[PDB]
Amino acid sequence: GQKVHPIGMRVGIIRDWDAKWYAEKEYAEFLHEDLRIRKFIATKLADAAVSTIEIERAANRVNISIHTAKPGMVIGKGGSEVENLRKELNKLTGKRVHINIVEIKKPDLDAKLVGEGIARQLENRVAFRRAQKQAIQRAMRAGAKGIKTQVSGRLNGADIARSEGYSEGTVPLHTLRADIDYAWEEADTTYGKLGVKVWIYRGE
Amino acid sequence: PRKGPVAKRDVLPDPIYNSKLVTRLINRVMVDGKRGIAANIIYNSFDIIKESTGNDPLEVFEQAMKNVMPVLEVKARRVGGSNYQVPVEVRPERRTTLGLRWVVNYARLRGEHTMEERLAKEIMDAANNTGASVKKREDTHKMADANRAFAHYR
RNA sequence: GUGGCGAAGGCGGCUCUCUGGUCUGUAACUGACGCUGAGGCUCGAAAGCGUGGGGAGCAAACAGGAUUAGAUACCCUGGUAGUCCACGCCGUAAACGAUGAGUGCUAAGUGUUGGAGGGUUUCCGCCCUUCAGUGCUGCAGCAAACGCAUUAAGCACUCCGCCUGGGGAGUACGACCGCAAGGUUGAAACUCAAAGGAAUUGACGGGGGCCCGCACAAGCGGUGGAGCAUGUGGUUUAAUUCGAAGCAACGCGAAGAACCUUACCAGGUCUUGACAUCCUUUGACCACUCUAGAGAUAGAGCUUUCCCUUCGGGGACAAAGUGACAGGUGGUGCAUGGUUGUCGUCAGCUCGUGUCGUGAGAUGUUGGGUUAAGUCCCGCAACGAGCGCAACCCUUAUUGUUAGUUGCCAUCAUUUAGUUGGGCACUCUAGCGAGACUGCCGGUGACAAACCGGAGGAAGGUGGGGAUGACGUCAAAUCAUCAUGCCCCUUAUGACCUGGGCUACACACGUGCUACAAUGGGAAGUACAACGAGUCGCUAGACCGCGAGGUCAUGCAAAUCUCUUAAAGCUUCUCUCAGUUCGGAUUGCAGGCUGCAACUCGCCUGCAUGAAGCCGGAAUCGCUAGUAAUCGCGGAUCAGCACGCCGCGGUG
C-alpha cells in the first residue's frame, strides 16, 4: 500500500469539501445526518446515474444539490418525483429540504460514471480486455489529457487473482495543481468481488 | 565521510580571558549542557591557581598544555586478517584535543572534595612535568618509537 | 623464448662413439621412375603384469589425530606396492588443431627461427628482393551461428577411413589375441517423441568491479550487571479469549480490563428469537408502584387507549398466529475486494520514426566528466516522447502595505497595576505583495556542464524541516474495522444474567523508568517559555486540614476568565567520601477521591521500616547542530486510572 488517495491529497488546495457547513456543539448529529442522507439516496442512483451530492444547511432547512446525467428520469413527468424525494427526506431529517438538481455535461469524463459503467459489463460475462479499452477510447474522444484504468480480483471467473490495466496519454500524479479525478467501485460475475479503479486527467 | 573532508566547527572565544582554549576547556568539563556550572568551576580553579603560588592562569595553563600534548601516536590497523599497529604523525587540532581530554579525564579521577580542588591541582602538577597525564603522554611515546618495527614499511 | 627437433607417442646439465631426417644454391645426370593404399607389419603417454636388481624424496591401499548429524572424504602425523635400471608382455587416453594424405589456384598488413642474392658499402648494425618453417590481424568467398581466411573450414581433381533419432549398448552370442587384467570385432527383443548444436531475453551464483548510505572509521551517551513498570515464550489453570514471529513479531491491534468493554470459564435461563422485512387479527405501545429473586425474570396494582375523515382509510405499536426467515468475533489472508509493512524517497520502467540482425533480439537507455538524482555537458546510428527526479503545496528565517480589539504603552495625568482618559508609534495578530536566481565579480576545468573564492544582503548554492513513495519483490500482514465466493452450526457454535480469569509464577528474551552520589542531597529567597483544552466543563478568591483535599462562592461558550507563580537556573546556610542526611524497593497503621461497588484488581496522602545497588564481560545500540545529552508543560482515549504514545519549548 503505497499511494495516497488522489482526491484527499488535493482537498483544501484546489478542490473544496463536498460538505460545506459550519457548526459547533451540533457537529456529530450533522455529520451522521449527512451520512444517512447520502447512504439513502443511493436508491434512485441505482438507475439515475448520480455522481456527486452537495449538502448545505441553514437555520433549520437543508439545501441539497445532486449532479446527474438523467434530468427527466429523476424529476418525473411534470414534477411528480422531486415531490417524493422531498416528502421522503423530511421523514428522516425532520426538517425542510430543498433539492436543486444540477445536470452534468460530458458524462464520459467522470470517474465514478465511467468506472461504474465498465464494472457493469463484468457482471454480464464480458471480457475485461475490451471493456477497459473501449472505456479509454470513449474517454479520449471527449477530449482528455490522460486516463488510466485497472481491474483486480479473480479474472475470467478463474483461480488465483491478478491485476492489469491500460493507460492512454499522460496522467501526472505527483503534480499538486493537476485536477485529476478518481473513483473505486465493485462488482461480481459469480466469484468473489472485483475492484475497478479509474483516473482521468482533465488539465489544470 | 565518503564524499570528502569537512569543516572545522568554529568556536566563540570566551569573553573573560579572550582565549579560545578556555572555551574548549569549558566545553569539555560541561556535562548534560549545564554550562554555567562548568564556567563557575573553571573560574574558581583559576582563582585558586593565581591565589596560591601563581603568576597568571593563562601562562601556567599553556605550559601545562605544552607538557602534556603528544607528538607521536600510533594506529592499530587491519590488512587482510592479521592486525598490527603502526606509528604516524599527529596533526595540530588532534594534539590539543588529546591534551584537554587527558587533563580533564585524569582530574575527574583525583579523589578530593571538589572539582576545582582537582582541576587546579592537576594542571599545576602538569605544568611541573608530573601527574598521570604526563605519564600517559610518555606511555604513548614509548609505545611509538618501539612499534615502529612493524611500521617501517607500512 | 606463440623458440628448436621428431610421423606421432615425445625430446632440456656436460664430453666422446655409432646413426636417421630436413632446409638452401647450383644445373653434372636419369628420363614419369609419381600419388593414395583394404588385408598385412612396425612404432605407440601413464597405469598394470613377469623375472632379477635398486630404493633418497613423493605416495594408491592402510594406521592414528581432527571436523560433522554421520565422514569408510577434503585437513595433519606416519606409511606399503609403485614411481628408477635390464630384459619380455600389454596396446589403450579429451593419443586434440575433437580439422586424413597429395597437388594447383585466389587481396593486403605486421612479428620471430634457418638460408640465398643486390645496393649503400667498417651494412658484418641498414633498405630491397627471394625460399622454407612458426605466430598475430584482416578482404573476396564460405558458415546454422560461433567463426575460418596462402598454416582455409575458400575454388577444384585423385585415393582411403567413417556417419544415418535417443536409450538398451561398446552390451550378449560366436571368433581371433593376452600369463592376467582385458583389447579388437559386433546384434536383436523391448521402450520414448524427443535427444542435440549455436545464440537471445530474464533469474540465480558459498563470481568480479565501481560507487553511494550513522554502513565502518573519529567521537559523545547508552543496553547487557541492580530494583521496578510493561510485552512475549514457557509452565500453570475451569479459563489464563483471538491475531502478530529474523531484519520488516515482542510499551504491537489496545488512543485507557475493577462491573461494562468481553469473544474465554462455572452456575441460573430463552427459542420467529437481543436485531430486519412480509401477511393476518388489527391498530394508538407505556411508564410508575409492591412482594420473590444474585440478577435474568415471574406474580399482583391507576392503565399501553384513534391525533385522517366526505361515515367509507391511512402513520406509530403490544401480543398472537405464521412461516418465509433471522443470527455466527465459526473455517478458508493459499479463493478475494479494500487497507498497510520492506527494499526505499533507492533512481529507475517503457514507446514512436530510423538503423543493425537469417531470426528471437539490439540500439537508444553504452563511454568520459559531473550530480542527491535516467540531474546536466561532450562524444557516439540514432533522433524525439511518457511515467518517475525536480518544480507547483505547508511551516520556519527578513520586511512593505491594509486593519487596531479582547492585543500593545513610546510622547502625557492616574492609581495596586495598562487601568482610565488618550493613541495604533513599537511588539502582536492575519489577508495581500516583495525577497535567492550560480543572479553579478576571480580562478580551475575540453572555452562546456560543474567545482573552489569574493561582494552585497536577514538568508547562498535543493537556506532548515514536512507532505509527496514509479514498474516490481516477500502466495509478507489482516475473513476480528468493513465487505465478500465456497464450507459449517441452527431448542445451538444463536441469545439474556450474576461471579470469576484476561493481572496466575521454579524461569528465559525484548522495550523502558529510578539510581549507585559532592558537576551531589536538604532548608530559605529570586527569575525566564511555547504548543494546546474548557458548559453541566476549566475554578478565581476567602477560610478549615501537616498533607492528598473539603466548604462557601466568582469569571468565563473564550487574544477578555481559567487550567498556568514551568523545571533545570541564580543567591545564601548547611552536610564531609561513609552503604552515608546517597538510593527508595518491600512491609505495618491511619486517611482522601471517583464510582451502585476499589478483596481478587485503582490512583493519591502521612507517619513508621529502609533491600539490591559503590558505574556493570562476551557482545551490542542511537546520533553529523539548535542535532546528541538533560529539564519540564500540554491532550487524544477517559467517572477514575500512563514510567506508554502524539506535540511544545528551556539550557546546549
Instruction: Tell me, rounded to whole angstroms, the distance of Cα B30 from its chain centroid.
Output: 15
Choosing from A81, A105, A129, the residue where a domain stops is A105
Secondary structure (3-state) at B134:
helix
Distance, Å, B65 CA → C54 C1': 83
Distance, Å, A19 CA → C179 C1': 112
Structural domain span for residue A166? 106-204
Say if A115 falls within a structural domain. Answer: yes
CA A185, CA A113: separation in Å to the nearest integer?
Answer: 10
Domain shared by A154 and A79, yes or no: no
| Total domains in the fold of chain A | 2
Domain shared by A77 and A114, yes or no: no
Strand partners of residue B85: B76
Say if A112 falls within a structural domain. Answer: yes
Distance, Å, B5 CA → C436 C1': 27
> Residue A198, Cβ neighbours under 10 Å: how many?
29
Say if A49 falls within a structural domain. Answer: yes
CA A10, CA A1: separation in Å to the nearest integer?
Answer: 19
Domain shared by A29 and A88, yes or no: yes
CA B120, CA B118: separation in Å to the nearest integer?
Answer: 6
Q: Which helix (H) or strand (E) holds A98?
A: strand A96-99
Asked whether the beta carbons of B102 and B135 are under 8 A apart, the reply is no
Instruction: Tell me, rounded to whole angstroms, the distance of Cα B55 from its chain centroid.
Output: 22
Asked whether the beta carbons of A204 and A10 are under 8 A apart, the reply is no
Closest CA to A10 of A185, A198, A165, A172: A172
Residue B78, CB half-sphere, CA atoms under 13 Å: how many? 2
Report resolution in angstroms.
Answer: 2.9
Q: What share of chain A is helix, strand, coil (3-state, %, to 5)?
A: 30, 30, 40
B35 φ, ψ (degrees, to nearest 5)? -85, -35
> Domain locations in chain B?
20-143
The string of DSSP codes covering A127-175 is -HHHHHHHHHHHHHTT--SEEEEEEEESGGG-SS-EEEEEEEE---SS-
Q: Which nucleotide is nearest to A162 (CA to C1')?
A: C336
Q: Which nucleotide is nearest to B34 (CA to C1')?
A: C651
Say if A6 falls within a structural domain. Answer: no
Domain shared by A201 and A111, yes or no: yes
Q: Which nucleotide is nearest to B4 (CA to C1')?
A: C212
Cell output for A29? 448529529
Say if A29 falls within a structural domain. Answer: yes
Distance, Å, B102 CA → C378 C1': 55
Provide the H-helix boundaries in chain A. Answer: 28-40, 45-48, 72-75, 82-93, 111-117, 128-140
B37: DSSP letter? H
Asked whether the beta carbons of A119 and A152 are under 8 A apart, the reply is no
Domain shared by A29 and A84, yes or no: yes
Choosing from A105, A125, A145, the residue where a domain stops is A105
A194: DSSP letter? E
Say if A3 falls within a structural domain. Answer: no
A146 φ, ψ (degrees, to nearest 5)? -175, 155
Nucleotides of chain C in contact with protein CB (under 7 A) are 211-217, 220-221, 335-344, 372, 386-393, 467-472, 475, 477, 483-485, 518-520, 568-571, 576-577, 624-625, 628-630, 650-652
CA A171, CA A148: separation in Å to the nearest integer?
Answer: 7
Domain shared by A114 and A197, yes or no: yes
Domain shared by A85 and A171, yes or no: no
Q: Are strands A146-153 and A162-169 parallel, antiparallel or unpaired?
A: antiparallel
Distance, Å, B31 CA → C587 C1': 39
CA A155, CA A127: separation in Å to the nearest integer?
Answer: 9
Say if A173 falls within a structural domain. Answer: yes
A166 φ, ψ (degrees, to nearest 5)? -135, 145
Strand partners of residue B73: B88
Give the largest Cα separation in chain B, rounded: 57
Domain shared by A163 and A182, yes or no: yes
Q: Which nucleotide is nearest to A195 (CA to C1')?
A: C337
**AA identity, residue A117:** G
Asked whether the beta carbons of A171 and A180 are under 8 A apart, the reply is yes
CA B90, CA B75: separation in Å to the nearest integer?
Answer: 11
B90: DSSP letter? -
Say if A85 falls within a structural domain. Answer: yes
Just give the CATH number of B20-143: 1.10.455.10
Burial class (CB in 10 A: 0-12, 13-18, 19+), A16: exposed
Q: Which helix (H) or strand (E) holds B74?
A: strand B73-78
Instruction: Tell me, rounded to whole angstroms, the distance of Cα A188 from its chain centroid.
Output: 19
Domain shared by A100 and A183, yes or no: no
Residues 6+ apart with CB under 8 A from A70: A47, A48, A49
CA B122, CA B127: separation in Å to the nearest integer?
Answer: 9
Q: Which nucleotide is nearest to A164 (CA to C1')?
A: C471
CA A152, CA A131: separation in Å to the nearest integer?
Answer: 14
Domain shared by A56 and A72, yes or no: yes
